[PDB]
Amino acid sequence: AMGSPIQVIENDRASRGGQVYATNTRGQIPPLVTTDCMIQDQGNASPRFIRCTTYCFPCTSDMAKQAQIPLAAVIKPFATIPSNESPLYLVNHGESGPVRCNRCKAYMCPFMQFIEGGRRYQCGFCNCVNDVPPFYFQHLDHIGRRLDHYEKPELSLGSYEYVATLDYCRKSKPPNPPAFIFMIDVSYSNIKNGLVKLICEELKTMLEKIPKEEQEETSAIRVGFITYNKVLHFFNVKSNLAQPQMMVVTDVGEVFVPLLDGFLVNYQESQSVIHNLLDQIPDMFADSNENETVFAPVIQAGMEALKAADCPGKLFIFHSSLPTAEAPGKLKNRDDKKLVNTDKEKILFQPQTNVYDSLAKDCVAHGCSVTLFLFPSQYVDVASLGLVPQLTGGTLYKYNNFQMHLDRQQFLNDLRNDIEKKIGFDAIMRVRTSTGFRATDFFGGILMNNTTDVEMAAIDCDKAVTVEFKHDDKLSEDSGALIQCAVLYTTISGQRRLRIHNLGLNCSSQLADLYKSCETDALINFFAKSAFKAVLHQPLKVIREILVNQTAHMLACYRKNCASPSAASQLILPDSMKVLPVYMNCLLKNCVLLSRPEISTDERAYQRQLVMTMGVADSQLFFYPQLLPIHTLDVKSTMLPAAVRCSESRLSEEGIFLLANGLHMFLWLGVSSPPELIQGIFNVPSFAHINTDMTLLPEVGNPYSQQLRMIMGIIQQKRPYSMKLTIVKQREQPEMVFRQFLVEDKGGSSYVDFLCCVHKEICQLL
Amino acid sequence: TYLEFIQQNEERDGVRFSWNVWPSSRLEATRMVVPVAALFTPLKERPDLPPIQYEPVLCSRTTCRAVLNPLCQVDYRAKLWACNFCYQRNQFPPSYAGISELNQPAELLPQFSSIEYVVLRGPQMPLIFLYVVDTCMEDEDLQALKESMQMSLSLLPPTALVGLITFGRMVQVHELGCEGISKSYVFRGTKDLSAKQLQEMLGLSKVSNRFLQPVQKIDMNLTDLLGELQRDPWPVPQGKRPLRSSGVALSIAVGLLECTFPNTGARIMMFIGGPATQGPGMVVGDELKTPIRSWHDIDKDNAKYVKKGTKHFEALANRAATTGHVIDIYACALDQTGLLEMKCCPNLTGGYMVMGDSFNTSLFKQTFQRVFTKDMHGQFKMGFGGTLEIKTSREIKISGAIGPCVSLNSKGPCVSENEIGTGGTCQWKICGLSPTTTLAIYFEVVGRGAIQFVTQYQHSSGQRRIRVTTIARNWADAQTQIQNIAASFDQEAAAILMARLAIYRAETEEGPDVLRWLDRQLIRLCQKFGEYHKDDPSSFRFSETFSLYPQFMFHLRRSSFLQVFNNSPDESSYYRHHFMRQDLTQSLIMIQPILYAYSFSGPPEPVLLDSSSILADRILLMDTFFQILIYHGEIAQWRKSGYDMPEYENFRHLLQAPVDDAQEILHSRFPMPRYIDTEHGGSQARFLLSKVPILTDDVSLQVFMDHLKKLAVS
Numbered sequence A: 001a002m003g004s005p006i007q008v009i010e011n012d013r014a015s016r017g018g019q020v021y022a023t024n025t026r027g028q029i030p031p032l033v034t035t036d037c038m039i040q041d042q043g044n045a046s047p048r049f050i051r052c053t054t055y056c057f058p059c060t061s062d063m064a065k066q067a068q069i070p071l072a073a074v075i076k077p078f079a080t081i082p083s084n085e086s087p088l089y090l091v092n093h094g095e096s097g098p099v100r101c102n103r104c105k106a107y108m109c110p111f112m113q114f115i116e117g118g119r120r121y122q123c124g125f126c127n128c129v130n131d132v133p134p135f136y137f138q139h140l141d142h143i144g145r146r147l148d149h150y151e152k153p154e155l156s157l158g159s160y161e162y163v164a165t166l167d168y169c170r171k172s173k174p175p176n177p178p179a180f181i182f183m184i185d186v187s188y189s190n191i192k193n194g195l196v197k198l199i200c201e202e203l204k205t206m207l208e209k210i211p212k213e214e215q216e217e218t219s220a221i222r223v224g225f226i227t228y229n230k231v232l233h234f235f236n237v238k239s240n241l242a243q244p245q246m247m248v249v250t251d252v253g254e255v256f257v258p259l260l261d262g263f264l265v266n267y268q269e270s271q272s273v274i275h276n277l278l279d280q281i282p283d284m285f286a287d288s289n290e291n292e293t294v295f296a297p298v299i300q301a302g303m304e305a306l307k308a309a310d311c312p313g314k315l316f317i318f319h320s321s322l323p324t325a326e327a328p329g330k331l332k333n334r335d336d337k338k339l340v341n342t343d344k345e346k347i348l349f350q351p352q353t354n355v356y357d358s359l360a361k362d363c364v365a366h367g368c369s370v371t372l373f374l375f376p377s378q379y380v381d382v383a384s385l386g387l388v389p390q391l392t393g394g395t396l397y398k399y400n401n402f403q404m405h406l407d408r409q410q411f412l413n414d415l416r417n418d419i420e421k422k423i424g425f426d427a428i429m430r431v432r433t434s435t436g437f438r439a440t441d442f443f444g445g446i447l448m449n450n451t452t453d454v455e456m457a458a459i460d461c462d463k464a465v466t467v468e469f470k471h472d473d474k475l476s477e478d479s480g481a482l483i484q485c486a487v488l489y490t491t492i493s494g495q496r497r498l499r500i501h502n503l504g505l506n507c508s509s510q511l512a513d514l515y516k517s518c519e520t521d522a523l524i525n526f527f528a529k530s531a532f533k534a535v536l537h538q539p540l541k542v543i544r545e546i547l548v549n550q551t552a553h554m555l556a557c558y559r560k561n562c563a564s565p566s567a568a569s570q571l572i573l574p575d576s577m578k579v580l581p582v583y584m585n586c587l588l589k590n591c592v593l594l595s596r597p598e599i600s601t602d603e604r605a606y607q608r609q610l611v612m613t614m615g616v617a618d619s620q621l622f623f624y625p626q627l628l629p630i631h632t633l634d635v636k637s638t639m640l641p642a643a644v645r646c647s648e649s650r651l652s653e654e655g656i657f658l659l660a661n662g663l664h665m666f667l668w669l670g671v672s673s674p675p676e677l678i679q680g681i682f683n684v685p686s687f688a689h690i691n692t693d694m695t696l697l698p699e700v701g702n703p704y705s706q707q708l709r710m711i712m713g714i715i716q717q718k719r720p721y722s723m724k725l726t727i728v729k730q731r732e733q734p735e736m737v738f739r740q741f742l743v744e745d746k747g748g749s750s751y752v753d754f755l756c757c758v759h760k761e762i763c764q765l766l
Numbered sequence B: 001t002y003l004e005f006i007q008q009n010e011e012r013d014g015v016r017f018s019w020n021v022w023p024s025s026r027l028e029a030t031r032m033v034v035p036v037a038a039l040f041t042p043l044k045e046r047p048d049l050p051p052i053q054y055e056p057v058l059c060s061r062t063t064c065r066a067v068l069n070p071l072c073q074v075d076y077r078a079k080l081w082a083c084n085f086c087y088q089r090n091q092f093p094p095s096y097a098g099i100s101e102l103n104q105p106a107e108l109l110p111q112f113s114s115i116e117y118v119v120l121r122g123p124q125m126p127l128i129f130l131y132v133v134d135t136c137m138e139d140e141d142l143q144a145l146k147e148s149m150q151m152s153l154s155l156l157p158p159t160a161l162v163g164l165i166t167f168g169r170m171v172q173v174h175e176l177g178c179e180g181i182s183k184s185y186v187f188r189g190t191k192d193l194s195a196k197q198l199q200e201m202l203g204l205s206k207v208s209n210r211f212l213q214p215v216q217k218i219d220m221n222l223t224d225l226l227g228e229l230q231r232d233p234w235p236v237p238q239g240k241r242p243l244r245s246s247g248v249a250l251s252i253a254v255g256l257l258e259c260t261f262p263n264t265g266a267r268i269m270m271f272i273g274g275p276a277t278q279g280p281g282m283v284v285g286d287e288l289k290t291p292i293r294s295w296h297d298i299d300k301d302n303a304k305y306v307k308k309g310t311k312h313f314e315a316l317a318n319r320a321a322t323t324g325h326v327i328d329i330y331a332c333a334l335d336q337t338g339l340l341e342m343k344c345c346p347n348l349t350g351g352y353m354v355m356g357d358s359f360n361t362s363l364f365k366q367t368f369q370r371v372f373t374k375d376m377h378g379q380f381k382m383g384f385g386g387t388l389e390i391k392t393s394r395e396i397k398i399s400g401a402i403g404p405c406v407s408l409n410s411k412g413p414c415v416s417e418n419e420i421g422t423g424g425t426c427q428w429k430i431c432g433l434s435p436t437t438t439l440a441i442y443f444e445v446v447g448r449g450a451i452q453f454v455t456q457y458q459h460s461s462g463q464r465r466i467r468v469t470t471i472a473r474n475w476a477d478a479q480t481q482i483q484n485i486a487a488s489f490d491q492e493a494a495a496i497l498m499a500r501l502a503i504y505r506a507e508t509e510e511g512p513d514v515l516r517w518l519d520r521q522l523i524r525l526c527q528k529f530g531e532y533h534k535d536d537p538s539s540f541r542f543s544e545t546f547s548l549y550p551q552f553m554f555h556l557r558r559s560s561f562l563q564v565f566n567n568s569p570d571e572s573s574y575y576r577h578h579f580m581r582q583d584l585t586q587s588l589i590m591i592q593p594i595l596y597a598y599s600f601s602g603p604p605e606p607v608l609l610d611s612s613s614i615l616a617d618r619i620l621l622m623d624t625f626f627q628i629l630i631y632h633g634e635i636a637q638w639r640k641s642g643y644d645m646p647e648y649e650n651f652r653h654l655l656q657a658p659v660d661d662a663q664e665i666l667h668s669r670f671p672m673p674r675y676i677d678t679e680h681g682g683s684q685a686r687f688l689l690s691k692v693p694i695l696t697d698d699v700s701l702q703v704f705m706d707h708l709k710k711l712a713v714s
């Protein structure tokens, strides 16, 4: 009888929700990602920005090897700070630039001990001593606290922003504001399913919402336009035109941009000329009979346009099907089963040609990021298409078997979202640590050429990078472990900027403190991205064994070193890892690590990329969904209903439920569902009068339909992807797809199966 | 008279032979210094002739296959005719049945030795004018060029197909009639393309299109596009030349027609405003530090682009000829455009080559409109896709041709072993020709001899036609009638035919041995047909049928056509292109310019091209074909003093008299010449005085004859 995930989440919500979490302590343990609470920085970076697997590091290397607890931080460096919480301040250190340690190269942060009348400060990271520059000097108090400790935010807060001087810029020159380039697949597939008109028609409205700062009246982002169907149709939309021009490029082997002016123009200047273009493109290709398309040249061109304008940018590719036309990046249909017990399965999750890596390297080297709206109806090789959007830090939206009457609203909401996303460009992240340990591995939509600088072409508020540390030398239980995540980047107004995140952590030689300071939602986050990245290199039966044996090796070490003596018939778990067996068992049930029967390689590749970009708030939900009972729902007096364990055992033939994991949202209906509810929600008399194939939003019932619409809205709030609703009648229905989300069931081995599996190898260690 | 025989045969048959009486043996023919050869103008102006509305009757022998002509014997009783070339007996078509000695068909009447038939191919095809426009030029030159292009557009027939390609850093093939949006296909101006590749990339079927569309349908759309065209947008750094991809745009221009309308009449009119800098066809580097090739540069092996660039246009020219299309080059720029590299395109096809300072000059705009001169019926004076076949009597064999032609390498009994110029064939292909188009056919010997010239061309208005010219000249026994042979000598025609040969040797690997060979023949001609006692130079005299020939050689060996080192490589190419294209009359004007004198004492009379004719009280009018100069004798003071005064009515007319004739020539001549008004001591007087072992140096005409006199007598 183990504490359920629900019992733990609601427990922490009771004792910590509705309370101020003030990050004023070194090894302080923040609440769960599942606990809505207010946060005051007070010297340490918010857990919305960065969370850790353990907030108290083992002090030596051998001690960490004992527990085998992975030391990692999940950095969401531009995460959406709630409206009621204190925002970041921007610090300008003059022509000199931000004050940094001469040896550590760490930026001025509250971890800098000022000494010697304030003339010199000792670095908190490498204990080096620096000369306080004259313009930045101040006296120190009895304590030493600078007089402006609470006045200058870089000395009191954990999160803030720096102004970057010209030596932080490409070519040492002020960069240019970025540009959005919209590129539409116009093959017969996207013509027929009415996709083209929609993007174009819908696009006119959307451009207005292009991001801009409060300090500027008109968005500094310029806009470019392209269509394609194995041939590239560029477009000239200069302001001084009555009619837009078209320039068609046919040399797909050696692509180029036929323009410089009239391509990437200010929308508010070229408004009438752009609307004139979007009105036409539907009619222009309405009678196109072309099916073959190209892909890699489209990224190749939008990247080239951005280099020609000497500016960063973001590509908005809208694609339909598998690119087959003879060109670079020509993808074949290569779905062949060599996944289990083959030692070569890693091929399926890798791109076919070698160019997509080189193409991705070129985009990052020039600050070009690719975001892709894919509309498949057949095999597409997500492993190949999504590789450039991932490495460039962009997002990927897949809409399996798009139909306008259904998935229109889902796609438009994803598209409005990605435009208005708060974006930074041409970014490079660097994670400096104190003495004794260093960042040795990185996970996310990133690219890395050396072993320290994490290059992100674009980065939004939803991206999150997972960073692994290893032991360099022995730490000190007095000073502990420090972390400083810095992200140099260019803004949507063209300014060079540094966002700084500082986090202090405790150190101890006692294993008890190491286990007492663990977070499961973050430990699950690391193990997933670690395993998902290992999919490319090692067999899945190897990866699952490593995850299992590292889990048992963590729990046995706790059994044989911390626990007060207990009987041999007991599995003893720490409070920080109450639910770690449940979640870990769900990761081993996920299709990325599971078997061929009934799941496309595309679906395995899509999820393998989705998780790689997630923060802890999102990685938690995707692996343990939220199951809400709707029949028992209070009416008109509603907060979010209490959650219910993910299992078929918790469903009722008389009930209605709402399962969501961040990407799909299922409405489940039992055979004996009360017809009173089915009428007040679906406007049909009985259960047998519903159609599963009609999964569009209903609206009429005032009493409940509004209550059901309300809880769906608050579930969707923090969620970056807008979820595909799927309605399930109970028996003999598309329930098979639904049942895979009930993660505590068998389906691999169930929850109580994996618990008992952990306890056999926890005693095999003996 | 023999001077009337020449004038009446040039006028009737468009032919002019070096000899009108031929030697009856190969041996004595060799010793005659000038070979049996003729300047043939296939489409000579002849408004007296009707266009006959039926198919020409042909000789039934496959190897002969000549056309019925007045020299063919006719037996009206048996309804048969004997071909005068192979002696085959030939039956008549049943539609001729009523033929009689007094009501004979037209092709048999000697008045119709030259005649034109109207064929019935069955497909009437429209003309195709493909514009290829350079956009690396100041807004002045481009705006004027747009007006010249809108003007040419108005003159084309309604059914004609027009097409627009523009180029600069890129190359754009525009889609016409695409309304509501302007679209074009773009290609890197640095990579070559084949016609098959371009057919695929543009998405075209094999063998009106989206790119070539009728004038009447797209007149409004093309003129709107033409008026909206602006200069190459890509900037030009300091000390650098614009990136101009002329070699690529033409390779795309030729290919665009090669895969859409092959084997039909079409003009690829390429207007360039500067040298191609982005290869292939690369004429010179992109940096202004280096200058364009000079004759001394290319001589010192110091023009690193010439051999590469020429071979591109060379292969490009043969493609267009083999397809059957014309390549014009309208090249106006303040410096060279690479005409030397591109000369093969208007030289092997029948294209024009127009040079100029800028497209915004009265010179260019006028010259361009003369291209589209219409005949008396509103049809262009152009013909397309011409096959020139020549049959000879069994005693004569064709050497080859010189001029706007491409060999079809069709062997036969009339082909000689030793060939000359474009030889080894009895058929040539002339893609674009005009009434003036004039070739030079060369013959070889081994009771009259006869030669037939058959030309099948596509007249404008899509009417397929065949032009037939049958000539005969007398056989003579050179051991008994040299006098009868020397009386038929055409000194004028023999002069051009030799210059035609001597300049063809100048393009080949042969060097200044041309002058050496040119004089070796001149000396041979004096020794054979000269009156003299041996070793008495003063005794030597000329027959009046020959006296002018040495003076022609004098002005030829010192002309621009063979002394290039005072001109630019593009200028020398411009001159030679026109000379091997002209009839006898204009060809003579090129070699020996015509000098007229005007004075108060007598009407205007032609004078000697020597400094003696330059007199203080004389106004001179010089006429080399390419420029018209007016020289005021030291009259210059009467002009500078303003003698407008009503008393000197006559002096106002003397100044006006040569100008009035100059304006006449400034509308008639197709390559409208440069005009020069200068006087005694003027800066531009240089253009007159200059125009005024090896045989001799740049020595006067009198010393030239003296050295020639003493050599012919020893």
Ligand SMILES: [Zn+2]
Pocket (backbone or CB within 6 Å): A101, A102, A103, A104, A105, A106, A123, A124, A125, A126, A127, A128
């Ligand atoms: Zn330091």
Ligand SMILES: [Zn+2]
Pocket (backbone or CB within 6 Å): B059, B060, B061, B064, B065, B066, B083, B084, B085, B086, B087, B088
């Ligand atoms: Zn015959």
